Structure 1
Amino acid sequence: VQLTAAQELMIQQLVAAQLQCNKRSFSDQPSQQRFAHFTELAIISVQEIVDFAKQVPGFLQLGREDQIALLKASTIEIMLLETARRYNHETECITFLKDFTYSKDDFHRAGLQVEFINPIFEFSRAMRRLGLDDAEYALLIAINIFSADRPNVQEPGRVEALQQPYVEALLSYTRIKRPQDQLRFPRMLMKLVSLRTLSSVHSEQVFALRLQDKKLPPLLSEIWDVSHKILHRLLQD
């Protein structure tokens, strides 16, 4: 009924690894132009999610083709967790990376479709009612990565076994944070359900953008379009 020393290190490692992501500010370094803006910010996020994944214990020990299969499916879902995490209820603006804030209007101009857009903002609202801290969001990401039900996964039994300790850690953590509220932990897990719906909704949105002459870049195409040369390079180096 209290976090083990092993579980405390795991959470600390994941939280510190999460802090490396989304450090790039709007000052920092560097209709149709608005689409090319989002892709570039997405590419930075994808790159950061790949490096995050390697730091998660057990991910590098899996076979290459499984690593890709997990990242292919989970990356958009990890992005949606992050957009929810620093969603501003007062302004109704979604933050990307450190400091890039966009209201629902800005997405409309980029050529995105209300079917895609409003469910994201709804999801970011619904997560707020939970009142999740940074440790919980971190464990939930790790749980999301090690999903044995993804397409083309060769070793489901391994992926399931790699997920188990993270589920146990979140069970313990939530029981300590809210002893009275036994059902908060289920409610958290039922957001993994919503992320799938959003994941397929996103796939319908990427396709609809292609019809209006808005193709994805090389990296974003590898993981979201209908060999993964660039993704291999990032998992190698």
Structure 2
Amino acid sequence: VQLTAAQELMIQQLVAAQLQCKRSSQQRFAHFTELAIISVQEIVDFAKQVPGFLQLGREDQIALLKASTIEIMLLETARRYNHETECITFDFTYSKDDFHRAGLQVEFINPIFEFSRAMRRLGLDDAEYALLIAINIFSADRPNVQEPGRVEALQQPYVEALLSYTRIKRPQDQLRFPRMLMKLVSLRTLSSVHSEQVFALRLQDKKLPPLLSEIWDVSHKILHRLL
């Protein structure tokens, strides 16, 4: 019938916390990694602000962040993708050739753009994006998760809220919410391709910095301090 006042507060808390998330070939690669570093730090600070993340064991908190960080970034990329200019903004704006010039393969870049256009067609507002990020963080099937049951339980409220929210925004379009959730399936494959991209960069004498190598290369000391 309608959103429950308890959810309205929770949604509104999530979007507000999110809006505070703001700074304005090897050299090109080394540039992008510093952008990745800043965004990772913003995500961990955001993850602290989500209800219940703090409650979990650090080992699980790490396990969720390692896997989630690439997918949250790809969601953020999709949110600020401009279909009028074909540029992705981090107001650090970049085109497809800028990503190619830094050593990223075309098999990885083109799908991110295709993913972004598909996300654009769904017409997601900030509340939908915020809830999608919460659902993404609390994924029970991430590797090396000690307490999958607790993680699944923390996810349910955000899936419930997202269901209720999508029903109010577009009552007639029932298939929007299923299609949104099916983008989570696409983020897993794009995360899988990203690991191949990392390895392909190593071949081109392009190795990751210390924070990013903790999460993406294959004792997360850097990641503990921020938590």
TM-score by length of 2: 0.98
Distance 2:95 2:190 in 1: 18
Cα distance, 1:188 vs structure 2: 0.4
For residues 86 and 110 of structure 1, the distance between their equivalents in structure 2, rounded to whole angstroms, comes to 20
In structure 1, the residue corresponding to 2:82 is in which secondary structure?
Answer: coil
2:53 and 2:61 in contact (8 A); partners too:
yes
Asked if 1 retains the 8 angstrom alpha-carbon contact of 2:24 and 2:92, the reply is no
Offset, 1:51: 0.4
Cα shift at 1:32:
1.1
Offset from partner CA, 1:193-224 (integer Å, 9 cap, x none)? 00001000000001110111111110000000
> 1:17, CA displacement in angstroms?
1.1
- The alpha carbon displacement at 1:108 in A equals 0.7
Structure 2 Cα separation of the partners of residues 77 and 30 of structure 1: 23
Q: Shift of the alpha carbon at 1:20?
A: 1.2
Other-structure match for 2:196:
204
Q: How far is the alpha carbon of 1:30 from its aligned partner?
A: 8.7
- Deviation track 1:163-186 (CA, whole Å, cap 9, x = no partner) reads 000000000000000111111110
Alignment CA distance shift 1:193-1:109 (3 Å): same
Following the alignment from structure 1 to structure 2, what is the Cα–Cα distance between the partners of residues 167 and 80? Answer: 20
Once the two structures are superposed, residues 133-185 of structure 1 have per-residue CA deviations (whole angstroms, 9 ceiling, x without a partner) of 00000000000000000000000000000000000000000000011111111
Q: Is the contact between residue 28 and residue 101 of structure 2 (CA under 8 Å) also seen in structure 1?
A: yes
For 1:131 and 1:120, the matched residues in 2 are separated by 17
Q: How far did residue 55 of structure 1 move? A: 0.3
Q: Secondary structure of the equivalent of 1:115? A: helix
Q: 1:14-25 residue pairs with structure 2 within 5 A?
A: 14-21=14-21
Instruction: Calculate the TM-score normalised by the size of structure 1.
Output: 0.94
Judge conservation of contact 2:74–2:187 (CA < 8 Å) in 1: yes
How much has 1:49 moved relative to structure 2?
A: 0.2
- State whether residues 104 and 197 of structure 2, in contact with CA within 8 Å, keep that contact through their aligned partners in structure 1: yes
User: Cα distance 1:2–1:199, how it changes in 2: closer, same or farther (>3 A)?
Assistant: same
1:35 lines up with 2:29 in the alignment: yes
Shift of residue 191 of structure 1? Answer: 0.3
Distance 1:130 1:30, change over 3 A: closer
* Counterparts in 2 of 1:180 and 1:106: CA distance versus 1, 3 Å: same
- In the TM superposition, residue 2 of structure 1 has moved relative to its aligned partner by 1.0
Could you report, residue by residue, the CA deviation over 1:30-60 in whole angstroms, capped at 9, with x for unpaired residues? 9110001000010000000000000000000
Out of 169, 193, 204, the position equivalent to 1:177 is 169
Size of the alignment, in residue pairs?
226
1:76 shift after superposition: 0.4
* Percentage of matched positions with identical amino acids: 99
Equivalent in 156, 164, 167 of residue 164 of structure 1: 156
Deviates more, 1:29-38 or 1:226-235: 29-38
Contact 2:2 2:164 in 1 (8 A): yes
How far has the Cα of 1:3 moved from its partner? Answer: 1.2
Query: Where does the alignment leave 5 or more consecutive residues of structure 1 unmatched?
Result: 22-28
Evaluate the alpha carbon distance shift between residue 30 and residue 120 of structure 1 in structure 2; reply closer, same or farther with a 3 A threshold: closer
Distance 1:30 1:162, change over 3 A: closer
- Aligned partners of 1:161, 1:58: CA distance in 2, in Å? 10
- Counterpart CA distance in 2 for 1:111 and 1:136 is 33
SS in 2 for 1:186: helix
Which residues of structure 2 form unaligned runs of 5+? none
Conserved 8 A contact 2:87-2:96: yes
